[PDB]
Design a protein around this ligand. Structure first.
Ligand SMILES: COc1ccc2c(c1)c(/C=C1\Oc3cc(O)cc(O)c3C1=O)c1n2CCNC1
Length: 819
């Protein structure tokens, strides 16, 4: 409409945190072009969504049930408790039973009714054995009673959506211009690969430097591959100071032609360096001007050598020899899906004819389309090393086959993977969009993962923003309402975190002018702004309402984060236990998100091989620059705050918090499990050496790391843990022979997915850890995983580690103390 369309786009702009209608920072219509283009995908998914299963969004997995979780249910029977008003009864169910089965069973024993979960916004519905729901599978993990309130199915009317040449390519470098030696290096890149490179003559380094030079390259105009970047860089002794890119071929297949004034990025190897976006800070940024006016058999020994190349890790560099060997035998390599990354990385993309052949390869592709989806393999074809629409599209095609349970597992990295797409509209984008709209849960975390970057990343906010809007216009009017509240809450509570922080610096400790000011500001919100109830952004199912002013402190840390607690705004909550958020400024929680996400993935791995290291990957979302919220683990304490250089303290503290030897032997169990998991998970990611301050433990033995900021001893295994494990400097015990038992059993489980991990660790570095990431930085996880060696001298390798941490004891922790 007029004002009604303006109000709708005004709302969308407020939810996004960025204006997608703004054009004061483009030089084409690709961002606009994408908006119009993504409509069809949007409308198609919206059209074909089961309104009932959508509103209720059953969180389900089609995976088996772990050995350990089969034990809890030792009778092919499961106890589910149903409530109505204040009514209550207990039903015995078969693991292979159905929501409908059990429901009808209750009615006949004692329509239009559905089983909702107690305290949450979770639904136990669908044609799935209830031994396949996540909530049910969760209770069993923590040994709990599946409480379920029975009421009416929610109205889908709420999820409603509103009505809508053969010349050598040459480029002239006019000159650079900055408000307040030097030369220019104009590369033609294609997926990290450099095809041609031309520099300008060195000149004095002043605010305005002109060359008026035509830079001819070695490449024809037809040899230019779609997705090729013109990478303009600026060097001074000598160092890279400014970079900017420009897609040689545009979003509509046209060869770019004309005059360009480009504002660059300055520095201070990663994902930010291949963006088609220009610095929007015209007032301060450097500028740059340019002109565009343009079968058979195979020998035994050779097969052997080809099969050795295809076996190596994804970080193993390809020799020229290797590459030519791959490409001469492409049809024998196509037999093997695990040879695809290396195959297309051995393609000369700077040759029209070759690329032509390559597309002839992807014609079929019979074997690829028939391979059991290898996610670790699919990720490799979506990284920086690949920029061919067709290559990346066979990876996205392979993603189309996983359940929603797995999309959630990788949503974060797939979203960050968008940073590698050359164009805005892409198989990947449209996929995150298609899958988000179809599942309420995915759409939720999608929102916050995009908003995370749209708000603190100038390099990509424009692209992500066009994608977010795409999702918002088809998520539902019920989802929109929700999001608007969540945005207001963090918008308010962030004010309070920054305002409070400026009232005190290091050495501030805490004074009661703050304990008065803080508990005075939570009023303004409570009685005016703060909504009656807002959905928790790290746990969608949990609604939180009123505040708990009394229990809201201001952490006495090196900086000032908040300790907020809320009352569950849901009446039917099984018990009482506040929801605690920690609003923090000063750290980058986008690095935390990444580690926590990989932690969840290591769980799923350990799950396939029936292990349970009971990790504690708490929720953690990044809201803005250097600011975000964390989920407060209940009944947890720091080892540091536990000793405030003694060993027995841990045991005393556990026993103190554990009434009976039974509820204490579990506290040493949960401890040994959680301890092994965190010792392995950490050693692999190279974030092993921590301080006693950055490790916590619940009153029930569960150990868990925190604050993975910018993170001598392979990992924290101090004698204080050992005392709990009944061991003292060099002596051996059962719980310690059980410790080495769990560890190696888990460490090897990960080595079975070396390829997957490596690609996530790699990508994580490029999209999450700034700035320059060496090729040597990644080389770590290889050795940390011991690529190659059998499960023999590999387990031995790891068991050497466990020993170092014992023969070091407190050494490092004490050295940490020195400041
Ligand atoms: C994570 O759940 C917690 C439970 C209790 C907690 C904390 C967290 C926490 C502090 C923190 O947690 C964090 C988790 C992160 O990913 C990143 C961070 O920068 C932090 C952090 O600064 C403190 N306490 C007890 C009272 N002093 C401090």
């Amino acid at each position: 409409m007029s004002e009604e369309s303006q109000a709708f786009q005004r709302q969308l702009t407020a939810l996004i945190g960025y204006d997608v209608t703004d054009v004061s920072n483009v030089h084409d219509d690709e961002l606009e072009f994408t908006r119009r283009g993504l409509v069809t995908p949007r409308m198609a998914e919206v059209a074909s969504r089961d309104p009932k299963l959508y509103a209720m969004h059953p969180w389900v997995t089609s995976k088996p049930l772990p050995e350990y979780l089969w034990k809890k249910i030792a009778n092919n029977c499961i106890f589910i408790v149903i409530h109505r008003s204040t009514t209550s009864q207990t039903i015995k169910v078969s693991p292979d039973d159905t929501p409908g089965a059990i429901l009808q069973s209750f009615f006949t024993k004692m329509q239009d009714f559905v089983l909702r979960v107690c305290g949450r916004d979770e639904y136990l519905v669908g044609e799935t054995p209830i031994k396949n729901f996540q909530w049910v599978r969760h209770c069993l993990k923590n040994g709990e009673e599946i409480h379920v309130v029975l009421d009416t199915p929610p109205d889908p009317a709420l999820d409603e959506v509103r009505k809508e040449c053969d010349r050598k390519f040459r480029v002239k470098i006019r000159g650079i211009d900055i408000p307040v030696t030097v030369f220019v290096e104009a590369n033609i890149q294609h997926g990290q690969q450099v095809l041609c490179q031309r520099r300008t003559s060195p000149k004095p380094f002043t605010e305005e430097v002109l060359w008026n030079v035509w830079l001819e390259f070695s490449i024809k105009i037809k040899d230019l591959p779609k997705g090729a970047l013109l990478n303009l860089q600026i060097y001074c002794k000598v160092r890279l100071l400014y970079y900017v890119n420009l897609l040689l071929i545009d979003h509509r297949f046209l060869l770019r032609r004309g005059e360009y004034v480009l504002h660059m990025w300055q520095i201070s190897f990663n994902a930010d360096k291949l963006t088609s976006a220009t610095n929007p800070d015209k007032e301060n940024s450097m500028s740059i001007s340019i002109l565009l006016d343009n079968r058979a058999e195979m020998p035994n020994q050779l097969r052997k050598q080809l099969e050795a190349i295809i076996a190596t890790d994804p970080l193993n560099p390809l020799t020229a020899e290797d590459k030519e060997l791959l490409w001469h035998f492409r049809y024998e390599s196509l037999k093997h899906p695990k040879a695809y990354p290396k195959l297309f990385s051995s393609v000369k993309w700077g040759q029209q004819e070759i690329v032509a052949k390559t597309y002839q390869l992807l014609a079929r592709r019979e074997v690829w389309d028939q391979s059991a989806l290898d996610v670790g393999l699919t990720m490799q074809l979506l990284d920086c090393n690949f920029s061919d629409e067709n290559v990346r599209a066979i990876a996205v095609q392979k993603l189309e086959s996983l359940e929603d349970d797995d999309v959630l597992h990788y949503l974060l990295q797939l979203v960050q993977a968008v940073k590698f797409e050359p164009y805005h509209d892409s198989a990947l984008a449209r996929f995150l969009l298609k899958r988000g709209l179809r599942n309420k849960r995915i759409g939720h975390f999608l929102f916050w993962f995009l908003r995370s970057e749209i708000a603190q990343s100038r390099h990509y906010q424009q692209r992500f923003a066009v994608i977010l809007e795409a999702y918002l216009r088809g998520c539902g009017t019920a989802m929109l309402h929700d999001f608007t509240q969540q945005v207001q809450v963090i918008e308010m509570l962030q004010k309070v975190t920054l305002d409070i922080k400026s009232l005190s610096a290091e050495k501030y400790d805490v004074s009661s002018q703050v304990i008065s000011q803080l508990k005075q500001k939570l009023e303004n919100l409570q009685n005016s702004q703060l909504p009656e109830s807002f959905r928790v952004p790290y746990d969608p199912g949990l609604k939180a309402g009123a505040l708990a002013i009394e229990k809201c402190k201001v952490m006495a840390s090196k900086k000032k984060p908040l300790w907020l607690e809320f009352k569950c705004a849901d009446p039917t909550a099984l018990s009482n236990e506040t929801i605690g958020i920690i609003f923090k400024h000063g750290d980058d929680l986008r690095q935390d998100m990444l580690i926590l996400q990989i932690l969840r993935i290591m769980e799923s791995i350990w799950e396939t091989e029936s292990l349970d290291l009971c990790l504690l990957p708490y929720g953690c979302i990044s809201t803005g620059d250097k600011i975000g919220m964390i989920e407060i683990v209940k009944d947890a304490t720091t080892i540091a705050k536990i000793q405030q250089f003694k060993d027995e303290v841990l045991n005393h503290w556990l026993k103190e918090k554990s009434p009976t030897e039974e509820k204490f032997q579990a506290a040493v169990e949960r401890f040994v499990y959680s301890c092994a998991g965190y010792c392995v998970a950490t050693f692999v990611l190279g974030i092993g050496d921590r301080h006693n301050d950055n490790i916590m433990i619940t009153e029930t033995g569960n150990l868990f790391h925190i604050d993975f900021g910018h993170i001598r001893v392979p990992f924290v295994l101090t004698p204080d843990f050992l005392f709990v494990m009944g061991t003292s400097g060099k002596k051996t015990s059962p719980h310690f022979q059980k410790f080495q038992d769990i560890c190696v059993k888990a460490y090897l489980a990960l080595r079975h997915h070396t390829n997957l991990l490596i690609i996530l660790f790699s990508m994580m570095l490029m999209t999450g850890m700034p700035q320059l990431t060496s090729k040597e930085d990644i080389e770590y996880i290889r050795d940390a995983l011991t690529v190659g060696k059998n499960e023999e001298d590999a387990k031995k390798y790891f068991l050497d580690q466990i020993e170092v941490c014992r023969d070091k004891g407190w050494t490092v922790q004490f050295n940490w103390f020195l400041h």
